[PDB]
Structures are given as C-alpha cells and as structure tokens.
C-alpha cells in the first residue's frame, strides 16, 4: 500500500497547460505552465500525493469509437489504466460520467462562437441560416457531440450542415481552429468553449472575438478511473479551493493578467 | 425491496417552489409550482420513482450548530433520515458534501448584491467602505457561511461589520430580505444568490436590481443521504436533462417568461 507517484494525464491547451518557451532546458513537471499546472500542484498538496504530468499521447479530449467502442484521448488514458487522474479542461458529460469519475466542477463554461473581427455573424441562428461563412468544431470532444446529438432545431440544422460540409469544417486541435479563423478572412467561424474563446480574444494579434451568448452551460471536472479511491479527496480539494478563492485567483492569473490586447 | 414513494424535501423559494394561489383547493404535489417542481417530475420520470413533495419544516437550507453539532434545514432532513432526496436550490459546499451526496450541479450561481433602485452602491467594495447603507444575508445557508469563513480582505471586512451590526442585518428568509430592501428607502442592501436576485428584478413592483459582478461561482445540486443508492441515477438524470436542453427550457420558463417588468 506504498505511496505511488500519481500519473496525471493532461492536454496542451492554452492557458491550461502550455510548454514553457525554454522547455528543452527543463525536466519533468517544470517543462509546463498554466492554470491546470497550478491547479495540479494545489490538488496534490491538499490530497497528499506526488505526481508526474504527462501529455495525452493522441492530443485528444476523449470520445468512443462507434464500432470498436474504444475510447481515445484523456478519457481513454483513464479507462485503460494508463493514468491515475486527468487534470485538464475536461468537460463533464453523461457519456463520460458513465465510464470515469468526476469531481464537482472547477470551472464553468459553454459552447460559444469565435469569429474574425468584422465577420457579420452575431448568433448561432445567424450561422445556421447561411453557408458563405463556413463553421465547425474540434474533433473527439464534447462540442462536436453536442451538435451531433442535439434535437434543438437551430443546432440540428448546424450539425446537418457541418457533417456534410466540404472541405471538412472539423479540426484536430483548438490551435488549428483558431488558425483557420485567423487565415480565412472572415469565411470561417469556430465553435469552441467560452473559456478558450475568452482567452484567445485577449492574445495578440487580437483579431478574434467571442460573439453572442453561450449555447449551453456545463463544467470541467477533475477525472479519475471509475471507483478510484483518489476521487473523494480530489473532490473535497476542488470544493475547498473554490471556497478559499484559489480558483478565482488562478482564473485572473491566466486570463486577465495574461491580457495582451490592452 | 419494494418500490417506496420517495420523500422529497424542498423549500418555498421563488421561482423554485411556490404555493399556487389556489393551493387550498388542491392536494399533494399539485399544491406547488416552480422550477424545482418541474425538475422533480423530470428526475422522477428518468429514475423511475414516485414521490411526495414536502416543505422543510423549519424553512431553512441547512447549517450545523457549532455546539450541538445538529444540522437544521433540508440538510438536516437528509442527515437524520426524514427525507430521501432534496430537490431545491441547495448550494454545493465543502461542509455539506462531507455529510450528504450531491449530483453534479443543475444550475450555476454566485453571491450577488440586491439594491433598491437608485441606491449609490455598485460593488462589494463600495458596501465595505461605508455604513450608512446597512447590508446583510440569509441565516442558515451558504451565503452567510461564505462571509464568515472568508479570508479575502473585502469580504472579511464585510463580515466584521455584519456580525456586530445593530439592529441585526440577518434575515430568516429571502422574502424577508427583499421586503427589507424594498421598505428601507435605499438604506439596506441584501446579499443573495444571483439566481434569486435576477428573478426578483423582473417581478413587480420592479424596484430592485442586481448590481456589480458575482462575488463567487458555485452550483446547486440535487442531494441525497450519504451512500444512498438513488444518487447514481439522479446524477445521470441531471446530466441527461442538461444535455437535452431541458434545464435551459425550465430556466426560460420560470425566469424570463415570468418577467413582469417588461
Ligand atoms: N473541453 C472539451 C473540448 C471541446 O470539445 O470543446 C472536451 O472535454 O471534450
Ligand atoms: N442556496 C443557499 C441559500 C443562501 O445562503 O443563499 C443555500 O443552499 O444555503
Ligand atoms: Cl467558473
Ligand atoms: Cl446555469
Ligand atoms: Li446547462
Ligand atoms: Li468559483
């Protein structure tokens, strides 16, 4: 029953986990910085464990293949026994809750629209009623699944377009989506979680923005393999850190103190 | 192992649970209406149980006495075996999570400031720096505990004032707090959760408003006695109802379709 170093799976997603510019000079956990790097240190301190940060091998959040039923991404790392905990912007969803355990949420968010500044779109309804401006989502995460499973008219219409659009409107990483918005001269809009959208709006070159309200409301949770004894302590730590204002401090540190757009 | 009617504890708090105007003509669950009445019906349908709504006897959310260590309110009803589930705007907190089980949250909120229109206050900092305008909170809930336990300078200053203020700035129910704001000619401001503040701002006589940002961020959860077998199904139902847009529909029904202030 010896104490064992906890293997943490996480994902390179700004400002949650980022490679320090000089990462090749550094070793181990010191290579990384961000909101989730700081949160991992706090959770570990409050739960009394030592840990090793690892970046998910496939760069994905996690989805299940319809035919093989195999989970990929961080969810897969937990499900198949490769990691002990995921500390990442991992959205709590019904399908995931059935296969992994989640803390109460450490951050709230909703799906939102990113545009290149000046794009004549203000809402999901606006996007759904036109095709000149292409729009899409990240693969292998909760946002794509939201559209695929929606029975709400506007979102069904959006999914109906996205699933058949040529060329593909889907991207492998948030960075790819943002690059496509920036390089498409207003002819691509990107659907992504409000947290990431709000961060990117305050980073140079300051050419994107969030428009409209959020399309839904949900949260990120710290995930553990189903039935793991670590889950109880981690959940209490999230609640304690929230109540002591630490999560709000980290939000301010990594979003608004990081603002470059004045 | 016979199916047993589930006893639901809840609280009279608008627009979550309200007595219908003609309640004396009605019996049982039909006496009540509101967001949590609708949510209870949906949760029960998705979990396959029958239920009886009961209003918490002491009219309280739930706190533990420092000396006797006895829990009151809805929390007490669960802890001492008087109810099987609480379906109410019951805030998920560390101290409660240790004694009862909670679903993932069904609604997000934060502590907020209610003023009578025209009161010269825009922030918690503003309140903390003066005493002409008295301010307080509800007894026996999470908002009072937030201030009592805060180590954040502005909130500690506020608690330092509130705890010794004469006459008392604390109230037994939200309705009492709102009445005091309305009747105090701008000389009382009330600290309460944003959800309730936003509802009341859209009800006649349309003389109150929310000012400033929220002071914190947290959620309401459906609560069960610790270890209850019902908790798993209830949690999945909350997630499913969120994902299918039902919670958003209920929010719109009970807040904005209920708007009387045009
Ligand atoms: N945070 C999301 C990523 C997305 O799909 O927007 C997830 O957990 O899958
Ligand atoms: N909803 C809160 C009430 C409050 O204190 O504002 C609770 O659960 O205690
Ligand atoms: Cl948040
Ligand atoms: Cl919400
Ligand atoms: Li939601
Ligand atoms: Li928070």
UniProtKB/Swiss-Prot annotation, chains A, B:
Site (Interaction with the cone snail toxin Con-ikot-ikot): 64, 148, 240
Post-translational modification: Palmitoylated. Depalmitoylated upon L-glutamate stimulation.
Location of Phosphoserine modifications: 150, 184
Residue positions the entry lists as glycosylated: 3
Site (Crucial to convey clamshell closure to channel opening): 121
Effect of residue 94 to Y: Promotes dimerization. Strongly reduced desensitization
Extracellular topological segments: 120-262
Tissue: Detected in forebrain. Detected in dendrites of neuronal cells. Expressed in the pyramidal cell layers of CA1 and CA3 and in the granule cell layer of the dentate gyrus.
Compartments where located: Cell membrane; Postsynaptic cell membrane; Postsynaptic density membrane
Disulfide bond positions: 206-261
Induction of synthesis: Down-regulated in the pyramidal cell layer of CA1 in the hippocampus by global ischemia.
Residues the record lists as binding L-glutamate: 89, 91, 96, 142-143, 193
Function: Ionotropic glutamate receptor that functions as a ligand-gated cation channel, gated by L-glutamate and glutamatergic agonists such as alpha-amino-3-hydroxy-5-methyl-4-isoxazolepropionic acid (AMPA), quisqualic acid, and kainic acid. L-glutamate acts as an excitatory neurotransmitter at many synapses in the central nervous system and plays an important role in fast excitatory synaptic transmission.
Complexes and interactors: Homotetramer or heterotetramer of pore-forming glutamate receptor subunits. Tetramers may be formed by the dimerization of dimers. May interact with MPP4. Forms a ternary complex with GRIP1 and CSPG4. Interacts with ATAD1 in an ATP-dependent manner. ATAD1-catalyzed ATP hydrolysis disrupts binding to ATAD1 and to GRIP1 and leads to AMPAR complex disassembly. Interacts with GRIP2. Interacts with GRIP1. Interacts with NSF via its C-terminus. Interacts with CACNG2, PICK1 and GRIP2. Interacts with GRIA1 and SYNDIG1. Part of a complex containing GRIA2, NSF and NAPA and/or NAPB.
Similarity comment: Belongs to the glutamate-gated ion channel (TC 1.A.10.1) family. GRIA2 subfamily.
The record's note on its domains: The M4 transmembrane segment mediates tetramerization and is required for cell surface expression.
Note: The postsynaptic actions of L-glutamate are mediated by a variety of receptors that are named according to their selective agonists. This receptor binds AMPA (quisqualate) > L-glutamate > kainate.
UniProt name for this protein: Glutamate receptor 2
Source species of the chain: Rattus norvegicus (Rat)
Taxonomic placement: Eukaryota, Metazoa, Chordata, Craniata, Vertebrata
Residues of the full protein shown: 413 to 795 of 883
